[PDB]
C-alpha cells in the first residue's frame, strides 16, 4: 500500500502546485520535491508500476516542462528532455492494461496532449502521425468531456486542427463552460466554417488578449491560428491580425515604462503579418485617397510600434526605483507564462516641423522585402515603396567583417555598401518619393540602423551623394522624438590634448579624467555636452552597454536613472564610435546604443560616429562650434570616387535626434 499512499500524497502536492495561487518561485521547489518523491517510488517499483504512480509521473513531468522558461530565443533543451521523459515513462503505462476506464481515459488524454505539446515545441520529435495516433487514442477512450476537464477541450481543438472531422464532440464543445473564446472560434471556423460565430468569439478573445501579458499561452496559439488562416488563403485573417496588433500595442502601452518588451518568438511574425494585412488593405483597389492614406499611416504606426520597444530574453533579465519596475515586470511575465495552462508625453506621428520629410523603415521577414513608409508635410501625403534587403544584408555583412580587421583600410567596402544602399533604395534619390532640398529624418529598422543612409550613392556613373541634397538626422523610433558648454574626457594620453589644454570656447564644468559621477553631477542643462571616452559593447544585454569612464564607467541603465540634467542639450558623443556600444549584426539588430539612452533622457540630439575614426576628424568636428549635414559636404565627404578613406571619416558622423 506504500505505492498507493505515496501516489496519493504526490497527487495532493501536484494538485496544490496546479493551483495558480502559489508563486512560480515556490512552485519549482514543490514540484522538485514531488519529482523526488515519485522517483523514489519508482526506484523499488520498476516491476510493472501501478497506473496511478505512472499518471502522477506523467503529470509531474508535464509540469516540470512548463515551469522551465525558454532562456534563449530557441526552445530550451530542458523542455524537450522533460517531454521525452514524460512520453517514455507513460509508454509503459499505456502499454499495460490498467483495468480502470477512468484511469485509461486519463492516461490516453495526458499522453495525447503531451504529444501535442511536443509537436508544438518541435515537429521533428512528433509528426502528424503522432497526432493521428493521438486522435485514435482519444476516440477509443472517448475523453471528450468538455464540461469536466479543459484537458479534453485542448486535445479536441488540437485534433480538429489536424484536418479531421470532430462533429461527434461538436455538441459538447458548443457549450464548453471551461473553454476560452479562441477555442470556440477555432471550432466554429474549422468544422462548421461559420465565420459569424468565429468572429463573435474572436472579438472577445482579442479583448481578453488586450489585458494579458505577452507570455501567456493565448498569444502564441492565436498568432499560430492567424498564420494558419493566412496559409489557408482565407479572408478573415487580416481583421483579426490587425485586432491582435491593436491588443498588443495597448497592452504594452502602459506596462514597461523603461521601454521594455517580453520576447516570445512569435511577436515579430505577429507584427510582420499584421503589417502585411494592413498593406494588402491599402492596395486593395481603394477608390478613395483618404482611406489609402490612412492605411499607409497605420503601416507607419505598426512599423514604429515594433521599433519603439525592446526585446530582451529573460536570461539577460535574470537608483533602486528603476529596479522595482524591472522586478515587477519580470515577476508578472514569468507568472503569466505559467498561468496559461493552470486552469513622458507621447508624440503624434503626423505632427512634424514644417519642411521635414520622415522615412519610416520596416523590414518584414514573412514577405521578405522591406518597406519604406515616407511622409512629407509639403503635401501631407503618405506613400510607401518596397525593396529587397537580402543582398544589401550580404554587402553590409561584408563591410562589417572587413571593418573589424582593417577599420581604416575598409573604405572600399564602405563605398560598396553605400552604393548598394543607393541601388537597393533608388527612391531615396527620386524626386517624387523624396523632394530635393527637404530635411529628412530616418527611422531605420533592425539592420538598417547600422547603414549610413545619409551616405547613399545614386546609381549613376557620377552618382551624387545623398548627403549633398538633404539634411539627415536619424532616430531609433518615432517614440523617442520629443547656456554653457560642458566637456567630459576619459581618453588615453597622447590623443585629444588640445581641447583639454586650449579651451576658449567654454568647458566650464569640464572634467579631464571624467568618471560616471561627473556625468551624473551635471545639474544645469548646457547647450552642448561633450563626452570623450570609448565605451565597450554588451553582446547580450544592451541595458548594460557602458561608456568607459572613470570609476567603472556609466552603463545604458545608469544614464536613464542617475543623469537628469541634460534636457534640450545637443550632446556630441563623438568619441566612442556608435558600433562599439552595441553588439554586431546577425540577421536582425534590435539593440539600442547609449545615444538612445541620452535621447530618452531628453537630449536634443547626439552627434555620434558610426565607425571608428581617427581622433583628428572628431576633434575638428568638436572645434566646429556653429549650429552636420553641411559640414560633411564641405569637409570633403563627397569624394568617395577619388578619396575612399576621406569618405570613410566624414560619413561616420550622424546626428541621432529630432530638432
Amino acid at each position: 500500500t506504500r505505492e498507493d499512499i505515496d501516489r496519493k500524497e504526490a497527487e495532493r502536492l501536484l494538485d496544490e502546485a496546479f493551483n495558480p495561487r502559489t508563486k512560480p518561485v515556490d512552485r519549482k521547489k514543490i514540484i522538485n520535491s514531488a519529482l523526488k518523491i515519485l522517483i523514489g517510488l519508482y526506484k523499488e517499483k520498476k516491476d510493472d508500476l501501478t497506473s496511478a504512480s505512472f499518471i502522477s509521473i506523467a503529470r509531474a513531468y508535464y509540469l516540470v516542462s512548463i515551469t522551465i522558461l525558454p532562456k534563449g530565443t530557441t526552445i530550451p533543451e530542458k523542455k524537450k528532455e522533460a517531454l521525452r521523459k514524460g512520453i517514455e515513462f507513460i509508454d509503459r503505462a499505456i502499454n499495460k492494461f490498467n483495468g480502470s476506464i477512468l484511469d485509461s481515459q486519463r492516461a490516453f488524454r495526458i499522453k495525447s496532449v503531451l504529444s501535442i505539446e511536443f509537436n508544438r515545441i518541435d515537429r521533428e520529435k512528433c509528426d502528424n502521425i503522432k497526432l493521428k495516433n493521438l486522435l485514435n487514442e482519444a476516440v477509443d477512450k472517448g475523453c471528450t468531456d468538455f464540461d469536466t476537464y479543459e484537458w479534453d477541450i485542448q486535445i479536441a481543438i488540437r485534433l480538429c486542427e489536424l484536418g479531421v472531422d470532430m462533429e461527434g464532440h461538436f455538441d459538447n464543445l458548443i457549450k464548453s463552460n471551461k473553454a476560452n473564446d479562441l477555442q470556440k472560434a477555432k471550432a466554429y471556423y474549422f468544422i462548421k466554417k461559420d465565420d459569424h460565430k468565429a468572429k463573435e468569439h474572436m472579438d472577445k478573445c482579442t479583448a481578453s488578449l488586450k489585458y494579458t501579458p505577452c507570455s501567456h499561452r493565448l498569444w502564441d496559439e492565436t498568432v499560430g491560428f492567424i498564420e494558419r488562416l493566412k496559409g489557408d488563403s482565407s479572408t478573415l485573417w487580416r481583421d483579426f491580425a490587425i485586432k491582435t496588433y491593436r491588443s498588443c500595442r495597448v497592452q504594452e502601452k502602459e506596462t514597461g515604462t523603461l521601454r521594455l518588451r517580453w520576447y516570445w518568438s512569435r511577436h515579430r511574425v505577429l507584427y510582420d503579418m499584421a503589417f502585411l494585412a494592413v498593406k494588402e488593405q491599402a492596395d486593395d483597389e481603394e477608390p478613395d485617397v483618404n482611406v489609402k492614406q490612412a492605411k499607409i499611416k497605420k503601416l507607419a504606426e505598426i512599423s514604429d510600434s515594433l521599433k519603439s520597444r525592446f526585446s530582451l530574453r529573460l536570461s539577460d533579465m535574470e537608483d533602486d526605483e528603476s529596479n522595482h519596475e524591472f522586478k515587477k515586470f519580470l515577476d508578472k511575465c514569468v507568472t503569466a507564462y505559467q498561468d496559461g495552462y493552470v486552469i513622458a508625453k507621447l508624440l503624434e506621428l503626423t505632427q512634424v516641423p514644417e519642411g521635414w520629410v520622415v522615412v519610416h523603415f520596416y523590414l518584414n521577414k514573412l514577405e521578405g522585402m522591406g518597406n519604406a513608409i515616407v511622409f512629407d508635410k509639403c503635401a501631407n501625403s503618405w506613400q510607401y515603396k518596397e525593396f529587397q534587403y537580402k543582398e544589401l544584408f550580404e554587402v553590409f555583412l561584408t563591410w562589417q567583417a572587413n571593418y573589424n580587421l582593417y577599420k581604416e583600410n575598409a573604405a572600399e567596402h564602405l563605398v560598396t555598401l553605400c552604393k548598394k544602399i543607393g541601388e537597393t533604395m533608388p527612391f531615396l534619390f527620386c524626386d517624387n518619393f523624396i523632394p530635393n532640398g527637404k530635411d529628412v529624418l530616418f527611422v531605420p529598422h533592425d539592420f538598417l540602423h547600422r547603414l549610413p543612409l545619409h551616405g547613399s550613392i545614386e546609381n549613376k556613373t557620377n552618382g551624387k551623394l545623398f548627403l549633398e541634397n538633404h539634411s539627415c538626422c536619424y532616430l531609433p523610433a518615432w517614440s523617442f522624438a520629443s547656456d554653457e558648454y560642458v566637456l567630459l574626457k576619459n581618453f588615453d594620453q597622447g590623443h585629444f590634448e588640445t581641447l583639454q589644454n586650449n579651451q576658449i570656447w567654454g568647458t566650464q564644468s569640464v572634467k579631464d579624467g571624467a568618471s560616471s559621477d561627473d556625468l551624473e553631477n551635471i545639474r544645469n542643462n548646457p547647450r552642448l555636452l561633450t563626452i570623450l571616452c570609448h565605451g565597450e559593447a554588451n553582446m547580450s544585454n544592451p541595458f548594460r552597454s557602458m561608456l568607459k569612464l572613470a570609476n567603472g564607467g556609466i552603463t545604458y541603465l545608469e544614464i536613464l536613472n542617475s543623469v537628469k540634467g541634460l534636457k534640450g542639450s545637443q550632446v556630441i558623443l563623438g568619441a566612442c564610435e556608435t558600433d562599439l556600444v552595441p553588439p554586431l549584426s546577425d540577421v536582425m539588430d534590435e539593440h539600442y546604443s547609449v545615444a538612445t539612452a541620452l535621447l530618452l533622457i531628453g537630449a536634443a540630439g547626439v552627434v555620434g560616429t558610426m565607425w571608428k575614426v581617427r581622433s583628428n576628424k572628431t576633434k575638428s568636428l568638436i572645434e566646429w562650434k556653429l549650429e552636420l549635414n553641411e559640414w560633411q559636404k564641405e569637409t570633403g565627404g563627397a569624394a568617395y570616387k577619388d578619396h575612399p578613406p576621406t569618405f570613410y571619416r566624414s560619413i561616420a558622423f550622424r546626428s541621432i535626434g529630432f530638432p
Binding site: 518561485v25 519549482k28 521547489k29 533543451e77 530542458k78 528532455e81 544584408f393 550580404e394 555583412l397 561584408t398 562589417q400 567583417a401 572587413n402 573589424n404 580587421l405 582593417y406 583600410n409 572600399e412 567596402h413 588615453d492 565597450e536 559593447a537 554588451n538 553582446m539 547580450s540 562599439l580 553588439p583 554586431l584 546577425d586 540577421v587
Partner: protein, 1211 residues
Amino acid sequence: MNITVELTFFEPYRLVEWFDWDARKKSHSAMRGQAFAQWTWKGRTAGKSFITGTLVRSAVIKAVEELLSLNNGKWEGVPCCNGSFQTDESKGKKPSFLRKRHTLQWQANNKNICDKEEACPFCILLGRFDNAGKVHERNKDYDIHFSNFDLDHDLRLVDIASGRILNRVDFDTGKAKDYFRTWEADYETYGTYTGRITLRNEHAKKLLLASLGFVDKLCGALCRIEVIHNDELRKQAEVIVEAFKQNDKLEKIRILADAIRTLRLHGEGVIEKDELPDGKEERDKGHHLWDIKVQGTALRTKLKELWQSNKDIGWRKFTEMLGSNLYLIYKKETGGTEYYSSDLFIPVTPPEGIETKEWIIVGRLKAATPFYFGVQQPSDSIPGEHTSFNILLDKENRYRIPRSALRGALRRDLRTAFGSGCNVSLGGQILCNCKVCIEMRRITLKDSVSDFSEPPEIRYRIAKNPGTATVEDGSLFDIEVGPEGLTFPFVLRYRGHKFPEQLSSVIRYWEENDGKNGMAWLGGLDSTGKGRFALKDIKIFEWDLNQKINEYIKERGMRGKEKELLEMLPDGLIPYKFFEERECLFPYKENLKPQWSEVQYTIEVGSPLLTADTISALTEPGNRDAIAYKKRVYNDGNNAIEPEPRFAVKSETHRGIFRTAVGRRTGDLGKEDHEDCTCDMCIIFGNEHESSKIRFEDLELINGNEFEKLEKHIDHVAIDRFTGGALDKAKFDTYPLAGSPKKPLKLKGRFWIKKGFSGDHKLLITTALSDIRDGLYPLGSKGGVGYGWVAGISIDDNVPDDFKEMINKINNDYVHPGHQSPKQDNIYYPHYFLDSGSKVYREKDIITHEEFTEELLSGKINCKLETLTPLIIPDTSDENGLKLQGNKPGHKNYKFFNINGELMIPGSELRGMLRTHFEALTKSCFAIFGEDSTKTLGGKLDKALHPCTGLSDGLCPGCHLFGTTDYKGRVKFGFAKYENGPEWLITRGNNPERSLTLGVLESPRPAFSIPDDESEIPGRKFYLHHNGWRIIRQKQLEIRETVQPERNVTTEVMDKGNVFSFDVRFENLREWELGLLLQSLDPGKNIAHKLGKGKPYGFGSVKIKIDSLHTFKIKRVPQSDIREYINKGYQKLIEWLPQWHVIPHIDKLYKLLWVPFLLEPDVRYPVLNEESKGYIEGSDYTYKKLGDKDNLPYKTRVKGLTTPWSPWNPF
C-alpha cells in the same frame, strides 16, 4: 602524376562515425563532427578509421587562399584570381558543405577571365574547370583529386579512440550551459594517415605543395602533411568479501577498497616485502584490516599471493582493478543537457602592403596548486567507477592539459582583458565579429601532457550538516588531483598583423614573474584553488610570414617540435623582442590585474593539528588510527616528487571553515534549501546556479623544520561510566602535528577575491577571518578536544591596505560538610558507586550549530587547574620514556605528557572528567557503557540510562551539551599548558629521582559490584581524594621487589600545588547550561576532581578555579553576572547562594569528590586472604572473608553504593 601524402597528428585528433550524407542529418554527433576523422565498422566494433579526401581538400584550398592572400594573390610569380565560392542553386546543385566563413580575397592581376583553357593555379586546385562536378566518383575526370586518407598501420574502436565529454562554460557565471561527447583518438599510436592526391594539371604543382606544407591543423589537432586479469581477480575479490562477511566485517570492506586503490601511490614492494603496519607485538590479532583470517590466511600474505599471480597487469593497474572489484562487490550486496549545436559570401580583402606574422609562445605551465582536469568515469567514457571524480590522463597515464580546457580558459581570460566579449553561440550562420572571437579565430595552441605518469593523490571531501555540525548523509566523495609543481609545455601560436595587447595582457597575467606569481586558472574545481597554473619559461618568437614564408613551409611552422624550440635556430624565426612588460599594458592593469585579489595570511596553531587522513593511516607503517594529512609536491627543479611530503590543511577544509563562519555570522546557513538564491553566503561562495566569487588555497605548513618530532603520538581511550575502566573496543591513537603554545605551527594559506565584492561582503569575509583568528573555528578534527586551536593570525604585508584596515580592530562560596571521615579520626574503598536513579531528561528540541542565537551565550573560559595530590598524565608515545627498560626489560616506564618539551595536559582528559561530572550532576544517561558483556551487563541498566542513539529520542543534558554521535558538542576544551609552579615530586631513591613506581593496576571487575541478579546495577564510579600516595612513596623498595617488574608501571609525578591553564570555548550554550558547566568546573572549596592514572591510589587530584569568563554576541562578564547563572542552573536542577546538598544525588556526588584534607584518611584496596600486607591480626580487610556470602551478606552493594564514604573494616 600521383602524389602520396601522409598525415601525422601531434595531439589527440577527433573521431566520429562515418554515417552518410543522407544519413548524417539524423545523427547530431556526426552532423557536428563533419570536420573530424571518420570511423566505419566492418558487430559494432573492430572497424576502420579514415579521413575523407573532401575534408583534406577543404583544408588544402583554405591554405591555398591564405598563401595567396599573404602574397596579394600571386604565388611564385604567377597571378591568381579570387576563384569563386558561390554556387547558383538554379544552375546546378549546392555543395555538400557550405562555407559561412569569411573568404580572403585580393586584386585580379589576371590577363583574362578564367575559363577552361588557361585557368590560374587557384582555379585548377579548386577543380573549377575540370570534367568532374558535384556528382560522385564516376570516372577519374578530376584535374585535381584528393583520395580518402586511411590509417597507416581488426582495429577495435576502444583501442584507437577514447570518449571524452567536452563543455561550454558561461562567463557571467562559472557554470556550463551544455556539453557534448567526442572520440579523441590516440595520436601516438594511431596518428598517421596516408592518402593519394592526383593532379592532372602540372601548371600548379608548386602551389599545391605549398598548401600541403601550410595546413596547420586537421580534425582538431596539429598536422604535418608530408609528401611520400579480470573475471578471475574479481572472483578472488568476491571470495575475500565473502570471508569478510563471515567475520561480520562488511562495513569496512569499503575502507579496504579505498586502501587498495590508494596503494597505487605506494610501490609494489610494499606488498612484496612487508611494509604494512604489523600491529602491536602482543596484540594476538595484529592489524584490524591486514591481519584478517580470509580463507584461512592473513590478508597481507594473500595480497602478496595475488600480486605474484597478477604481475602481468602491473602494480598500478592491478591495484586499481582490485579496488574497483571490492568496491563493486560491496555495492552489490548492500545495493548499488547534451547540446550538439543564411547562405552568404563575405569577401575579406586585406590591405595591400600589410605585414602579417605568426608568433609562437613556448613556455611551461607549472602548477602552483594541485590541479584537477575532470573527466567522465570509466564504463561511461567507452566510445559506443570506484573514484567519485576522475582526472584526465592519456593512454600512458601521464597528466594531460587538454587543448579544449586550455583554449576555454584562454578565451575567458581574453574576454576579461577586452572586457567586452560574447557568449559563444552554436550553429550560427555568420561568424561572430566581437573582439575576443576575432583573436580566438587566430590563436591555435597545442595539447600538451606532463612527463610524469604517476598515480594522482586522492583528495577526500565531505559536507557538514549545519544543524548538527557533523557529516551529512551521503556527503562523502573523493577527487583525483594532480601533484603541485608539475610542468606542462605551453604552446600558443597567434597569426595576424600585430600582436594584440590583450593577448600580451593574458600572458603577463599567466606569467610568473618576481611578483606576478602566475594567474592561469586552468580546469575545474577553481573554487577550492585547483589549477592555478604559473606559466613560466616564456619565450616569444615570430615568423616573417610575408617575405619568409618558404622557410615557414619548409619547417612546417615548427608544429610538433616545440620542445626543440623551448630547448633553444631555424631560419625566419627571429625572437620577438617587443613583448610589452607587465606595467606597460593598459588592458592588463585595467581588467586582468584587479580581477583576483590575493589575501595571504599565516595561521598560528598552538595545539596539535590533526586533519585526520585515515585512508593513508592504514597503508603507511606505524599502525596509527588517524594520521595528519600530507600533500604530494612535485619538485620540477630536480624532477620526481619530494621524498618529504608537505603537511597541510586541505583547501577544501579552509573554504568550508570560511563558508561556515560566514553562514553562522549572517544566518544564511541553516536555511531549508539553497534554491536559486542571492543570499550573502550564496553570492560570496557560489551555489548550484553560479560560481564562487572567492577561491581558497591549501594551508601549507611553513614552520615544520623547527620541530624535533613534527608528529606527536597521542593515545586516547573511552572509560566505561560503570566499571571505571576502558571500554571493550575504545583504545585508539591519533597522530597529530606537534603544536604547543610556546612553539606553535604556522600555516600560510591564501584565498583570492573577485573585483565585485561590496563593502558588506568584504566586511563579512573580514569578520570570518577575525573569527578564525579569535579561535571560534579550530582547524581539523577533534576540535572539541583541543586539537588544531588557532592561537592567532598574522596577515602578510602585501595584502591591500583597505582589507588589512578592517582586520586590525573567581571563588565559589559553597562548602560541603561531609561525614564519617572526620568523625572518627578506619579504611574505605578506593571507589564508590553513585546510584543517581533512572529519572533521565531528554531534550527533543536540540540546539542547532547554525548562526549564533542571540538568546544563548558563546565565548571562552580561562580556568586555572591546581593539583592537590601528584598528577600522573603519562605520555604513552614513548614506551621507554624514562630509559629504564634496559635494566629491567618488560617494565612500562612512562613520561609525563609533553609537546615539544613543555608539560601539558591533553584536553581529552579534561573533557572526559568534565563530561563525567556533568552527566552525574544532571542525571544524564551512561554515555559510554560496556554493553553485551558477561544476562549482559548492558541489559540490566533499566531503560533510560542507556547510551543515546540518534536524535530521534532526544539527547540528555550531558549528551546535549558535550555532544554525541552525529551531533557535535557545544563545548570545546583545550590543552592545559603549565604556566609555572613546583614542577616535580622528588623521590630520592627512584630510578630518575623524579618518578614513582606505581603498584599493580588491574582491570576493574564488575562481578564484585554485582554479585547476583538481585542487584540491578550500581551507578557511576568515582574515586575518593585520599592521601594514599604516601604509602606508595614509603613502600618504593617494597613494591619494586615484590610486584612483577613486567607489570609495574613507573612515570614522573608532578608535585603538590601545580597549576595549569586551559581554555573552554563554549558556544551556543544556554543561560543555565553555562552556569551548570561553571559549577561542574568549579564546584567550590573542599571539592575537587580526579585526573590521570592512580585515581584509586589517591593520585591526580585536581582543583579547578576560574580566572575570567568571556562572551560575545570579548565582553568580560563580572562576578555578579557569573552568579545568577549557577543560580538558574540550580533552579533547573531542582525541578528535574545555591545549596547543592539539598538534592540527595548531588549531595552524594559532592561527597564523592569532597577532599577531607583541605584529616588524613587512609583508603586502600583489600587483599586476597593472607596476601602481601594482609594485616589479618586486627582489621583483616581481606577478600574471601569480606566477600564471602556467609561472613558478609549481599548488602555490599548497599554499602558500596549511595554511601560515598562508608567505612569497610569496621562495617
